[PDB]
Design a protein around this ligand. Sequence first.
Ligand SMILES: [Cl-]
Ligand SMILES: [Cl-]
Lengths: 104, 104
Amino acid sequence: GCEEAGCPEGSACNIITDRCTCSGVRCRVHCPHGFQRSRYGCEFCKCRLEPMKATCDISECPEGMMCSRLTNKCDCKIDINCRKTCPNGLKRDKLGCEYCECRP
Amino acid sequence: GCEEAGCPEGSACNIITDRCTCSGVRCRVHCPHGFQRSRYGCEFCKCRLEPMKATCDISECPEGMMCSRLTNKCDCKIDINCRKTCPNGLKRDKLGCEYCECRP
Ligand SMILES: [Cl-]
Ligand SMILES: [Cl-]
């Protein structure tokens, strides 16, 4: 987890994987609602237009759904019933949810 | 200009400076309206919600205003009357326009 620890210089926290695999924001802009992220979980230097929901828990979620660490809403299917093998791993959608297609 | 040429591997086109100083998108997502950019002019892997205006010319512009290469709208003051010296150069705002404050 880097969501707490933080990251070595030259890397930033990926909010999806909670690993320091991101490059980090190449600026020092003040963003009232924080920085936007790529759908794969890295911040970049553009301000969000509205706040990210602060927290998410499975207990809040509908049947068959779980939290997205990208959106902190119950956006992701719990079971995407996917039996593909991928080198790059699976694609994520715009809500940061994996679905059953290999990353190109 | 990289807006046409394109960029060497490991770098991508900065739409503001038209120099290959960007890292490039670390994905192969299809975005119907293209990728979002940081306010300093680099694409990242999140899809735009609406299209960028395709083209901008000064002739379209109000008095005292010129095109933003970020937005292709007449967003920037032509004269920000700024006589600061900055190592990092001047800040840009969310429309990609310079204004009279040194980058931290
Ligand atoms: Cl911004
Ligand atoms: Cl996206």
